[PDB]
Amino acid sequence: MKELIYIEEPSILFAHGQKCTDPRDGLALFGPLNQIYGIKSGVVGTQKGLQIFKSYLDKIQKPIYNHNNITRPMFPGFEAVFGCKWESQNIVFKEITDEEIRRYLFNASTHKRTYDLVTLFNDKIITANKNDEERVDVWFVIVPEEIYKYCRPNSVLPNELVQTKSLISKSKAKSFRYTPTLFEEFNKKLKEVEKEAKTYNYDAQFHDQLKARLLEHTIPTQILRESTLAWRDFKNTFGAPIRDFSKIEGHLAWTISTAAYYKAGGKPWKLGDIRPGVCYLGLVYKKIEKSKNPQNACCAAQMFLDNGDGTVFKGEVGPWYNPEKGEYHLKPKEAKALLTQALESYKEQNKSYPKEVFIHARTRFNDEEWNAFNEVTPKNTNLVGVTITKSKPLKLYKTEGAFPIMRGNAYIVDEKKAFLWTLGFVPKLQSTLSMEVPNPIFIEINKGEAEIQQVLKDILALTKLNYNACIYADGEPVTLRFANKIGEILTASTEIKTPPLAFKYYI
Amino acid sequence: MRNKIFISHATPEDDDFTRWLSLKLIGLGYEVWCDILFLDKGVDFWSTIEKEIRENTCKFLIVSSTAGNKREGVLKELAVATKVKKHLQDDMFIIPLAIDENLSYDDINIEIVRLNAIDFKKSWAKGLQDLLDAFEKQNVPKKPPDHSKSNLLYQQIFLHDKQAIEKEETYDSNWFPIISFPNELRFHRYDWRLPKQFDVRTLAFPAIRYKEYLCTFAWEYDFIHQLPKTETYNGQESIRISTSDILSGRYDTDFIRNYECQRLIVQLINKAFELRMKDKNVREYQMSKTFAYWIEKGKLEKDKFEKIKLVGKQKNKYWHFGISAAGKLYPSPVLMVSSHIIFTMDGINLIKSKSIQHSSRRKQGKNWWNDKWREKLLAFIRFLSDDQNAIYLNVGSEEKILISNKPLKFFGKMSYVTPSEVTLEEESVLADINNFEEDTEDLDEL
Ligand SMILES: [Mg+2]
Numbered sequence: 014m015k016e017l018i019y020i021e022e023p024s025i026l027f028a029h030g031q032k033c034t035d036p037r038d039g040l041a042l043f044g045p046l047n048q049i050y051g052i053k054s055g056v057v058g059t060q061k062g063l064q065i066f067k068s069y070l071d072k073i074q075k076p077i078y079n080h081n082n083i084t085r086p087m088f089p090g091f092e093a094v095f096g097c098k099w100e101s102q103n104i105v106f107k108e109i110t111d112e113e114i115r116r117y118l119f120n121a122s123t124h125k126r127t128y129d130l131v132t133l134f135n136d137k138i139i140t141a142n143k144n145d146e147e148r149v150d151v152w153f154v155i156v157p158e159e160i161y162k163y164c165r166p167n168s169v170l171p172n173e174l175v176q177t178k179s180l181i182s183k184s185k186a187k188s189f190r191y192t193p194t195l196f197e198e199f200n201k202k203l204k205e206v207e208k209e210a211k212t213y214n215y216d217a218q219f220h221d222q223l224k225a226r227l228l229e230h231t232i233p234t235q236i237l238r239e240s241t242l243a244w245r246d247f248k249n250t251f252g253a254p255i256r257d258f259s260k261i262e263g264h265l266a267w268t269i270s271t272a273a274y275y276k277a278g279g280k281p282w283k284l285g286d287i288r289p290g291v292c293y294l295g296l297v298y299k300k301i302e303k304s305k306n307p308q309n310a311c312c313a314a315q316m317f318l319d320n321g322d323g324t325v326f327k328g329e330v331g332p333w334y335n336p337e338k339g340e341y342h343l344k345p346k347e348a349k350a351l352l353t354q355a356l357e358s359y360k361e362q363n364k365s366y367p368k369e370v371f372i373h374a375r376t377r378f379n380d381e382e383w384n385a386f387n388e389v390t391p392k393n394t395n396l397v398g399v400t401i402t403k404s405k406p407l408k409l410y411k412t413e414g415a416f417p418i419m420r421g422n423a424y425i426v427d428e429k430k431a432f433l434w435t436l437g438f439v440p441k442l443q444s445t446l447s448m449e450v451p452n453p454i455f456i457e458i459n460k461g462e463a464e465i466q467q468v469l470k471d472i473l474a475l476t477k478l479n480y481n482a483c484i485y486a487d488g489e490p491v492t493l494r495f496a497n498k499i500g501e502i503l504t505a506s507t508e509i510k511t512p513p514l515a516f517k518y519y520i
Numbered sequence: 521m522r523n524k525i526f527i528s529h530a531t532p533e534d535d536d537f538t539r540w541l542s543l544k545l546i547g548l549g550y551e552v553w554c555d556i557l558f559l560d561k562g563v564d565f566w567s568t569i570e571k572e573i574r575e576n577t578c579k580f581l582i583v584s585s586t587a588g589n590k591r592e593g594v595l596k597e598l599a600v601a602t603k604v605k606k607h608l609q610d611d612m613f614i615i616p617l618a619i620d621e622n623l624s625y626d627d628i629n630i631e632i633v634r635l636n637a638i639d640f641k642k643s644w645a646k647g648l649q650d651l652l653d654a655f656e657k658q659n660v661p662k663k664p665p666d667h668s669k670s671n672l673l674y675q676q677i678f679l680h681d682k683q684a685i686e687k688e689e690t691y692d693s694n695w696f697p698i699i700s701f702p703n704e705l706r707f708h709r710y711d712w713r714l715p716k717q718f719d720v721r722t723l724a725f726p727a728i729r730y731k732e733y734l735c736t737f738a739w740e741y742d743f744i745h746q747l748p749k750t751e752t753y754n755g756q757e758s759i760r761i762s763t764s765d766i767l768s769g770r771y772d773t774d775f776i777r778n779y780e781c782q783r784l785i786v787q788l789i790n791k792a793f794e795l796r797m798k799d800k801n802v803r804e805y806q807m808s809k810t811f812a813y814w815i816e817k818g819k820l821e822k823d824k825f826e827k828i829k830l831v832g833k834q835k836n837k838y839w840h841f842g843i844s845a846a847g848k849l850y851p852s853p854v855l856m857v858s859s860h861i862i863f864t865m866d867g868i869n870l871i872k873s874k875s876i877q878h879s880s881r882r883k884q885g886k887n888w889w890n891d892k893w894r895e896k897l898l899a900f901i902r903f904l905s906d907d908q909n910a911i912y913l914n915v916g917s918e919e920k921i922l923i924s925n926k927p928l929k930f931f932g933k934m935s936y937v938t939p940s941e942v943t944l945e946e947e948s949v950l951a952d953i954n955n956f957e958e959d960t961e962d963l964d965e966l
């Protein structure tokens with residue numbers, strides 16, 4: 014009968030060198046690892062939205078309580094937690110008139126509807142940021158619910174509200190050349206159609222298409238729905254709130270503030286212990302379903318050092334898909350560039366190449382892409398390749414009572430493959446992390462040679478390092494948690510000329 | 521000397537702030553005393569505390585709350601200081617702390633009311649900031665800041681009460697080992713006998729096409745009524761392999777290798793399962809990757825089995841507990857059972873819309889807990905058990921594969937201690953998790 018080892022719960026650093034398991038406690042006791050002396054908030058939104066922000070912002074200054082503060086740390090309140098003050102009266106407002114939204118929103122197809130609205134926000138944001146003498150740390154996008162409702166793919170605006178009539182079918186628009194007739198007058202209607210067709214190239218989610226559009230100017234932003242900020246107000250006919258945060262209200266405040274904080278530019282925390290020179294490399298693909306070539310897909314790499322701030326590298330769009338196998342793999346030529354892109358960032362970052370590199374994905378690497386790596390890997394560098402999957406085939410049940418096994422147990426199949434319980438029960442929290450019985454993950458070293466048990470520890474640690482969400486741990490290592498989301502942002506915009514950019518530019 | 525700082529904590533109501541405050545002071549370098557920093561088994565309380573304030577404390581702090589006034593224990597605690605006050609003769613020694621807008625002046629005790637307070641309702645950080653200036657004002661005897669003291673109290677005061685124990689235990693799993701295998705594994709040079717087109721998935725005995733041969737547990741004779749022109753086959757043309765020498769990995773060939781054989785058995789096991797399944801009288805549901813098989817309504821006494829419910833009532837729907845399977849060879853031969861929740865409007869009928877099944881499963885799922893799942897998986901296997909010990913999977917007309925209903929238990933080095941009933945609140949907080957599941961909302965839930 015094979016048996017399970019237990020991996021000691023990892024430890025993240027906080028200011029004052031206190032080391033703690035739980036960021037939420039860790040922040041309150043000791044605060045953020047590095048510190049900044051303000052959050053000059055930029056705000057884009059409607060009149061009513063702006064207040065909701067203010068009303069919320071004020072509230073957070075006070076401490077806030079969840080229902081079970083044992084299973085969820087209570088929120089002392091911004092000033093107390095971060096020291097730095099987030100001031101609702103130190104704001105920059107680029108207003109969006111309701112009469113402007115009224116205009117672009119009531120259009121027949123979402124793509125036109127969504128692109129036009131996204132266009133609107135950026136235009137202020139860029140315009141303000143470029144034009145204004147005064148710097149702002151973070152622009153706060155206050156999303157009316159109507160926009161959220163109807164600016165998502167598959168949103169269907171009722172015909173009886175359509176106020177502008179679409180000029181072309183979704184099918185035909187991607188194949189469109191505006192080319193000039195001899196007669197201009199005709200062209201004026203033709204340019205019109207060219208402008209509409211172009212919107213079908215951009216993705217139809219407001220959140221992704223905006224973040225993506227913004228990458229060029231490197232302006233961080235946080236996107237909060239009006240409903241989220243003042244959830245109590247938006248209610249069903251019954252008068253119940255549509256979304257109820259009453260139980261978790263402090264926890265929400267934990268999330269926003271933290272995420273606000275990092276985007277501000279100070280990383281709250283870092284892993285407590287790491288071997289030096291270790292470089293973690295998140296692989297990301299999104300099949301581009303658009304092109305007449307069925308293998309097209311996008312190529313993304315998300316590097317993580319100890320901090321978990323992250324860095325993102327724009328790989329090249331090509332035939333990385335094999336629909337038969339169903340996985341994604343890389344032609345050698347591309348593989349060479351990414352690492353080159355990646356290590357040359359590391360060297361610039363540290364002035365020396367990392368001793369160790371780990372690459373993460375969910376599909377066993379092919380052999381040919383993999384040796385395209387050795388050909389840019391410097392001789393002194395170990396280069397391991399790790400397949401991580403949320404295999405659904407294995408589950409561990411407890412003989413008595415209703416609580417699962419505690420996170421951190423591990424089944425080591427053999428010296429290259431093992432099972433890790435990122436999910437499960439936490440005693441520190443005296444409750445669990447999923448409602449169903451937890452599902453371990455499967456770690457294999459597909460390519461290269463490295464210790465199994467160290468990498469299980471290596472990976473459990475990457476669970477701790479999610480800034481965007483403030484929580485005890487995430488089930489995936491941070492490398493892949495956001496893999497799709499990043500995928501969706503790259504595919505969202507037309508041209509990936511983007512240089513590698515910091516991770517806070519994607520969330 | 522006396523440098524110590526006392527605090528009165530109403531309990532348990534104001535334990536949160538009360539907890540927060542002390543540690544911040546402590547890291548900096550201010551010695552502090554409060555009961556919440558010690559669990560007690562000293563038979564006395566009054567005489568370990570009242571004694572404490574007088575001897576060493578450099579200042580005294582109360583907590584103005586609804587249950588700050590109304591709780592007796594502090595009042596006695598303040599009175600000593602108040603009486604405590606006369607001997608020093610200094611008021612600055614005693615400071616109150618108000619944290620509730622709701623607690624009312626009338627409610628505030630008279631000893632309090634005169635007293636000059638620090639205000640926390642507006643913000644803790646501000647209130648606290650006021651205080652260490654007053655501390656600065658009195659020049660209270662306080663060492664330079666050491667927070668590394670503070671978590672060691674935190675890891676020990678709080679972490680200890682709830683933390684991982686060293687107790688070991690054993691864990692049922694979804695892994696059922698394979699009781700037995702047919703002794704030999706057969707390949708047939710049927711060749712001309714089998715047409716190239718033919719579909720070996722269609723076989724009606726588990727068989728897998730192979731590069732020059734067809735592979736099965738089954739005796740060459742077994743495949744007649746669907747594939748004639750086979751009685752022409754001389755059984756000595758059949759390459760046979762020992763079952764256990766594949767499992768041992770001892771087997772390899774110029775033409776074949778052990779991994780490959782292992783790979784092959786697995787597929788067979790899967791097919792062998794689907795086959796055995798139609799026999800069993802449970803209706804079936806096809807996952808896109810594979811099938812899953814579940815029980816229809818009314819086929820059980822009160823729709824239970826061995827007292828365990830397997831189809832019940834959700835809203836306007838009936839739900840059913842069904843399972844998938846696949847086997848593995850590396851690092852044991854076992855049958856892996858995935859669990860599934862499949863619904864029916866009639867209670868005998870599928871629901872067409874993908875998203876209504878999926879949506880339905882999750883909503884039902886939250887209500888369910890590991891004991892329940894274990895109890896349900898583990899009853900759905902004693903049902904298909906031809907014998908309680910195992911279920912017969914036919915792979916040859918006389919060749920069988922056997923699999924045990926007792927799943928393989930895992931040893932556990934480190935455990936925890938069981939809290940109770942907390943989840944249901946969490947579990948009903950999981951119905952309110954059908955909300956901020958937004959992709960445009962830049963948030964992720966627990
Ligand atoms: Mg459309």
